[PDB]
């Protein structure tokens, strides 16, 4: 999955979850 640790920085922008 795109959201797992809850950072900003780490979530691609367009990312398939």
């Known amino acids: 999955s795109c959201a797992t640790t ?10 398939t979850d």
């Not at 809850?6 to 691609?12: C, E, I, S």
């Open 6 to 15: 809850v950072d900003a920085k780490f979530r691609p922008n367009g990312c």
